[PDB]
Subunit: 337 residues, 6 copies
Amino acid sequence: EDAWQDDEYFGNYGTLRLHLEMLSDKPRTETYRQVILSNSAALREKVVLDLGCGTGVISLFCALLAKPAGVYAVEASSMAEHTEELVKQNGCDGVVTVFQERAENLTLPTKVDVLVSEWMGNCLLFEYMLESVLLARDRWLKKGGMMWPSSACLTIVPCQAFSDYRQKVEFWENPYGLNFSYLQSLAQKEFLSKPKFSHHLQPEDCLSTPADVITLDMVTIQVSDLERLKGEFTFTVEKSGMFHGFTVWFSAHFQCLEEDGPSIELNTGPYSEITHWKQTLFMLDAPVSVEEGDIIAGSIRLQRNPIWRRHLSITFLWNINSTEVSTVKTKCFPMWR
Amino acid sequence: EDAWQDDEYFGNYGTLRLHLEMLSDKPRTETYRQVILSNSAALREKVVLDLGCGTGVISLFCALLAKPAGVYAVEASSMAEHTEELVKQNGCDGVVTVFQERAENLTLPTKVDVLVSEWMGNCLLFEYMLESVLLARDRWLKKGGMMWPSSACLTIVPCQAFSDYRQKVEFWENPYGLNFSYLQSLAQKEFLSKPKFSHHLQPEDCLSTPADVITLDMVTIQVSDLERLKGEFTFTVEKSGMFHGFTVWFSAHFQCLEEDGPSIELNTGPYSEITHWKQTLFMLDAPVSVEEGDIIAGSIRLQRNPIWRRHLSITFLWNINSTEVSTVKTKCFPMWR
Amino acid sequence: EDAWQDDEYFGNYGTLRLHLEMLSDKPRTETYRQVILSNSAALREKVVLDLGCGTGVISLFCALLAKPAGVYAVEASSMAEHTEELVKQNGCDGVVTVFQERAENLTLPTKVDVLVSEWMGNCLLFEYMLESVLLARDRWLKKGGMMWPSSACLTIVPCQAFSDYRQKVEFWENPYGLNFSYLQSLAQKEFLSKPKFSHHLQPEDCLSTPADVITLDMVTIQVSDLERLKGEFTFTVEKSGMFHGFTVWFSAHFQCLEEDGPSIELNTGPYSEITHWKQTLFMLDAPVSVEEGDIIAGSIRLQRNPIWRRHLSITFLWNINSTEVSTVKTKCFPMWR
Amino acid sequence: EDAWQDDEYFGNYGTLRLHLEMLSDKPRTETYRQVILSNSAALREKVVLDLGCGTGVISLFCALLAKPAGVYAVEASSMAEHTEELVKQNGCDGVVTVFQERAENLTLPTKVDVLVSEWMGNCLLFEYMLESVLLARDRWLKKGGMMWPSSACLTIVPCQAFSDYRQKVEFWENPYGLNFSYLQSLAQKEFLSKPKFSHHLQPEDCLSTPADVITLDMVTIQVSDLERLKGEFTFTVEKSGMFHGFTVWFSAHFQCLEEDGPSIELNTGPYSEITHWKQTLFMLDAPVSVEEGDIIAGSIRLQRNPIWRRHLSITFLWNINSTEVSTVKTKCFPMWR
Amino acid sequence: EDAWQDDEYFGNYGTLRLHLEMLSDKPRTETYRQVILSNSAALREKVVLDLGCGTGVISLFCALLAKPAGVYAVEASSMAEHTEELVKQNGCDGVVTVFQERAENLTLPTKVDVLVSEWMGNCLLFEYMLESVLLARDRWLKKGGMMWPSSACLTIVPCQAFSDYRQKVEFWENPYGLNFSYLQSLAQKEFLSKPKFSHHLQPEDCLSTPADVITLDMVTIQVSDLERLKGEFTFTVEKSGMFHGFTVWFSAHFQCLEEDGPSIELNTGPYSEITHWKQTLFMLDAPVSVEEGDIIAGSIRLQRNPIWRRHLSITFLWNINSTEVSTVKTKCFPMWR
Amino acid sequence: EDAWQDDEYFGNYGTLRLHLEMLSDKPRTETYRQVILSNSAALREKVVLDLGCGTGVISLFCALLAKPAGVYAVEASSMAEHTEELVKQNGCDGVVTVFQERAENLTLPTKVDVLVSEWMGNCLLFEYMLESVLLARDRWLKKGGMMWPSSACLTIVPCQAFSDYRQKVEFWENPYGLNFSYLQSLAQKEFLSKPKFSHHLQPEDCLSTPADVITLDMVTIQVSDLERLKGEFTFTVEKSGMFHGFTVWFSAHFQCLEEDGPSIELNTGPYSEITHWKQTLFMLDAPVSVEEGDIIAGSIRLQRNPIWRRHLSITFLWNINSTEVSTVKTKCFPMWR
Ligand SMILES: [Li+]
Ligand SMILES: [Li+]
């Protein structure tokens, strides 16, 4: 709870600021509402566990847009005290029970048919709320029950970012006519060493088609699998341009409760409506100019921080039109420790 | 050990201050001595685990007022170093072994026939030493063995407290002729929002007969049960008076080792000799005047803090002569976070 | 240096982040460059003290766009180590001397003819670098010497902010059809209690013409004057609209070294090019609808925090079409403690 | 402000708890009210500085029970925000101005005729608010002006305290029949090493008549004098009894504004009505039995802590019926560091 | 990870300082290299887990001085990022895989045939890296697999240390002719109360032959055994001299993978080449002069700290030519809390 | 007292450890004793201020080896409590008065004829106790009075340190046959970036004769002078060898109270008996081989840390057989922030 930094994590969720940003995310919130809508009939007399309910929005969707047997809304932060009043004021305190408890030390009156949760962090895994979700799945989800989302994908693409490199590195060349170029090394180390949250990747700055590189099956994935997640990639560049680095985002997928129904997707990428996650930019130390037909191949590794359990390091290995050990570049981005 | 705040908890017990207050509590200490006395014969050749022995007083009662096979005195604080000398100076180092260990990571040479411990916090559960006690019971207590105390009760009663309300809220009306009434809202928020430890409830200020609202069976209760403890209550007011709030206390019960013997009680309530726990007062934001025949019904919930594992919140729900949802009042007291 | 929080203040300036934001502010940086340009002849053989030179940009303007006798560039943060290299790489280490010292404990080889500094914080005074500037003026500026800026103004205007009130307060009414209105009180307390940095006030949202309310003469102002700065205001509303609160900004003025020359202004308000300061928004708890001819009169007080010497509280008193004590509203905004 | 621990000192005064204890002290508050009453005529058109006004009670006494020209109520804690409303609600905002400032960095519109303050700490000096008072006297009090209190006295007496020694030291001899005497050395070191705040000395436990040992003239005393305050004492014991140690208290004296009037005293000793300060007990390591005619002579030293400027150490030197260097005992009590 | 103080423990290993001291220890590093050499043939196609590989030295010995199937090099500190480059630069990235993970939450692709680790702390157990080693053994070591070291011994001997006692205690008698003897009690408490790391015990200062007092079988020892380790000792003094206290060291033993091969030892005692551990000195409060034929008998206890899990207390019980309870001395040394 | 870190500075001096190291320094302590001896007659009826007396050793030298009128022994740490007993036990409490006060807020009964103090830190200035000494000189030293030491010198010399460079940088080339050379850059940054305290420079490793580069006149030096101390140097190398860097030490000089007497020196350099200060080594990033007749010229700057007032940075500028701007190297060593 210290190397999980639980006081700070859950303290940030006791304030309205973070909830205001989540409910203002329309693609994110309306996706969950449509999953409940699209599955309303199948959810009747089911028992739902809303893990990390926050203000309770997903629980109210279940209770008001369907007729389940019961909904267990679980929130560890102080916001749970208000959730209890919100479900009362929306006429749902006969269906929704609110537990101010952590998923880890959770006691529910029965097992559940569906576990629904909005746990995705930056680059899917940041803050590792996924670990809580999986612990509660193992203890409380019935065999054959539903996980919502049911799978999740990490997608990447080699990209351009002239805006970022010129304002943070090439800016120092001649501002107002002065030679501040000596600061470029420290600009490199301070600005390009860390990932850039809330990057808005424009479609015309993709140098290939994005590829899913990691996929998580929410029914089979084990907590031990999250220690070290790695995927392979190969890209053939389709526009001539400048390879400044990689942009990353995720997708969440929601299987229909019934065989015959189609899946619902939450896409945080550049061809979908922007979300509060936006995309995440990882810049190379030095840009390299590419041209159509070039191949950028390698791997991406999401290595969990062994001490600070809410953090991870993302390591890129890549190669340009070569398969040799000596042309292989690497770079490691902390997120955040 | 950080969200258990073990350095501060066990640091406070390394000082004589807290032990002086425990041994100065005669009802508390003499009760344990009489349990050993009243059960002396049955304890012969039994093995006793004194969990959290402190100065070792309960262990010395066992070794000197009975003839057990062995006594394991377990103390995690630095006071254990002195316990070892105290048992030597009282001629008991052939019977009593002292382990400077936490109950949680405890290795004893054999299982035990009796687990005796003085673990009760404010309103029974504050600081949740009960969790340590139950872990050690599961690992070290033999099947059929004794838990002392064997059960524990939480008792409440609707009460008066003119002293408290006038000195902390109505004081501000006209002190020395000045109108300091603007401070009443902040008096309400600062003084009446938290429980008052060491309240001495006078018998003439009970507005009904006290009722046990929660009961813990020390043999069957599970650690998972302590996350959320709730009880129901109904009171018919017997004196006309003013309902300022509720007073809370506990009882500990000690079953005889032999069928035929009677139980021994440790009562911390207002009709028993005062203890170092006294009673605990929970005041309403605004007092309400009641009269004989009125019914005050509702529930009390002891919800454990999910982050700070030594803390909890106590939530009261109550209703006066009505059973409707819209006349239902609630108030939540932190203890302490 | 603790209630000045100097380790955090100067630590933030050892990183390129804050310098990148200052040099990217073109109105701010080009104003200083034009002051040097417009006064180039008058600055010859003058001695300049650049107080808090940062990267050294103002010092390089002096040394390269004029021919002073000497420039003393004073920087307390670790960035001074790099300033020394930057002035060398720009061929100015014969004119510019760099001192890694605080203004307060500063030893310069001679007194100076001009003290130039960019000290303005949010609402002019936030962080009170003005105090350092005035101490160095008293110890090191020659009688008759120049202060740049030579005066500074705080300007305010009653404003609209539909965007802010609807997204932070009225949002909770019916998001996705749920009644989250119970959270409005906590939205009020969390979002509207503090000033909003980096507000971009649109001209069509001014309900009157802005008025300078406080003016600082950099030659006569004393450090003791900064404890409590107060100004009076009266506004006649010119558009019908909704009075959500007040927007605040500042101006810095630069007198010509020679009688005959005109002053140069740095305007951070809504009718000037946007700066890294933008404007600062102070919202009322509840909006009030106004119409042409209405008068909003009162005062604004900038009260320095007695303990945390980089902080202050801004208190608004105002009245609408009345001069009576009982229609007088007040509200106090911390910035930040 | 760190070795003054100003955040904690002034944070404790932002809460109603400490103000409730001060206004509940009737001898303390009514003394100040009677000083204003007894001097009402002489205070007309005078300017009063209420240093550390807290809730503003002394300022309201001045404005309502006299007709001064103006009252400056100075409070560094956040309580000042409420003081401003309290003086408005009591119809005094034409006479009383409230400054949320520290005495040290204080700017008042004029000098003052009377400086009235309630600054006394435990044993007069604890927390050294006296230093603030003297700084403000030097900057703001007119020549010939009044200091209220005008002098202050520290009084001591050799005493008995059977209650304290038996419960904290001799208790360990045979509690419940166990030999816990090994803990006596640690009882001595933990309980008798520090002064005991809120001791209530009974008159029958004085072994001589109390003597003033230190006297402070509020007009002539300098801040440099507070570093090290020392007084001499000789006592002839009048009852036979046991010398457990010394009890200490103080007096504050209030000279009449006019020659012909008598002084008003605030006595915190054992022959006066009890105050929130009570008295302060300093126990010897070992008690010594005394009998009528014995002389206990020596000194008491109030040595200010050089690092933690709100703290001090009190050192006792004493001798019983001897004047030799080798029978001279010493003991040093921290308060609190 | 807080009562394990993992941020500080693993932060110290992210710096080269501690690795420089380990690789500069030739007896320590060459022992591991010779274990790999002496067992090279038997290690072919085995899978090795190097637990806590640091710079990776043991892993490079395995990969370069033998031909295993694979080596898993596990390092929780930030040094792992460099380990990955070092194994690449030494041509071993086909055999050695580097995991930046804690042993506790470790996921390896297969089980292992040999677990090799250098975990020994001061007096063998300080910092309790042994706990990590045993957890990884239980999860990842195949039945019948090898532990390196395979056993470990704690050795002690009664010793002389004139140097230490004269410089730290008897020094104060007459330095430069002044009588500073009053400081001896505080010298005793400050200097002799704690163990002395990096003591270099000379052979002529042993008063008997050293004896192994505790032995750990790395295959059978359980984590629960480390809570409290105790051994017995008897010494007959062989030189006449002064008994200042006890010196302690350890041995690590490495069984051959094949029955027929002999064991390899790492000896940190006084008759072996000095290591970075040196020896550890525990001084008595007062020295006692001994003569040939005297018997010093008792026990040594390594009691783990229940709160700070990297720490322990070492308690000595001893007796000189007597077997009586009243001649039995004890002394407890913290290491370090 | 926070950016002076007074709690840690003076807390380290409350322990015997640092006093044991000072009194064990014979050259340091005997020098002060001989200054008192050599000046015994001249000190009769003089008043001496021993600033920062510690255990009181210098005060006892004055009182026992001379007959002054009075000695004021001033110590801010808790050790002062023991100093008072030590002067009593050495029969000097009629001559020596002990004040537990900081020099800064010091009140002495009279001015003094001699101020004697042992204030020298590493490289003379580290920890800037010199500032306290100079403040007390200005307030308490009579005109014409003596400062002991009366002057102080900083000496430097270009040096060799094969031991240091090979063990910390070249070690990584081939330890045990592995190529750990990739770590050399981080060895450079971690080991050679900071000064090395307690370096023992051997005479045969001086590449020229040492030169005093900075000199402090204790009568004329002002506190404002300590902000930035700079000296110039030129060295002609006399042995052929390798220029690894510079070694630094200091001298303290003690003028005779009488014209006719000679000065006494405390030399901490390599040709004098070693002191607890030893010497301080500053290594270049890369060594350069020099030969007889080469000139190494430049400057050394002791720049005080503006925030952490006990710290400084030492900046070296140097040039080898050239006077051009482009062959000029620089390197800055923190000490310690
Ligand atoms: Li922690
Ligand atoms: Li601080």
